[PDB]
Design a protein around this ligand. Structure first.
Ligand SMILES: [Zn+2]
Length: 257
């Protein structure tokens, strides 16, 4: 099936998903000297006070923290967006070593990891319908560097032992995703896609400038997960990032001077 290796990695994905070579693929390199400051961009509104996490899942590519998205609870609005987008899940991408792991890059710099908080446009009624629309998703992307521990992440790290292998899930209630946000909400934005198959071109990307710091111990626990299922040959869940894709006919816009 698709994955991150020699034989089924990103360089192969186009065979099953020809949109991989499309016009608006993600991630991309953010060239900070060309991104234009756009004074028409609004502050991002992140309203996560009523977020209801339900469960964490090892899907065989990453782990997903899932939310109850049956009501307007946890919503992203403003910024570059028109309307209201509901939080469905978050996950990460990370490396085997701290010098790689992010999907977006900044002037070619790779961070140790990248967090994606995935939200769908409530004008399309459900997630499956939204991913069929060019404005269906808003993904908030946050870089991770290694240094001080992020206290807000520790609940996530300490449940990973229980979801080591593909197909495992665990109850994961009352997790507050505000604890994963940096101080500033300054951002870059551009139109793009999901970074895993089916690679749909339905995302407004919002990539925060300011990384969060996590500890080496924290990221080390991400790297003990497994891509394989229970009892199969152990292949550590590392390097689950797609590299930068061509920018083509797109502009990256900065919310900040
Ligand atoms: Zn992602």
């Amino acid at each position: 099936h698709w994955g991150y290796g020699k034989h089924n990695g990103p360089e192969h994905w186009h065979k099953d998903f020809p949109i991989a070579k499309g016009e608006r693929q993600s991630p991309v390199d953010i060239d900070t000297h060309t991104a234009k400051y756009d004074p028409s961009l609004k502050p991002l509104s992140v309203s996560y006070d009523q977020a209801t996490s339900l469960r964490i899942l090892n899907n065989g590519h990453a782990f997903n923290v899932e939310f109850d998205d049956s009501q307007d609870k946890a919503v992203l609005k403003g910024g570059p967006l028109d309307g209201t987008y509901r939080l469905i899940q978050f996950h990460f991408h990370w490396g085997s070593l701290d010098g790689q792991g992010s999907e977006h890059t900044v002037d070619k710099k790779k961070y140790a990891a990248e967090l994606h908080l995935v939200h769908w446009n409530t004008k399309y009624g459900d997630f499956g319908k939204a991913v069929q629309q060019p404005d269906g998703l808003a993904v908030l992307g946050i870089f991770l560097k290694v240094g001080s521990a992020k206290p807000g992440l520790q609940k996530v790290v300490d449940v990973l032992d229980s979801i080591k292998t593909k197909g495992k899930s665990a109850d994961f209630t009352n997790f507050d995703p505000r604890g994963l946000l940096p101080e500033s909400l300054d951002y870059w934005t551009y139109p793009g896609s999901l970074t895993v198959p089916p690679l749909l071109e339905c995302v407004t990307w919002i990539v925060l400038k300011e990384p969060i710091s996590v500890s080496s111990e924290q990221v080390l626990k991400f790297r003990k997960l497994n891509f394989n299922g229970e009892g199969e040959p152990e292949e550590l869940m590392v390097d689950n990032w797609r590299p930068a894709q061509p920018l083509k006919n797109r502009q990256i816009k900065a919310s900040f001077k």
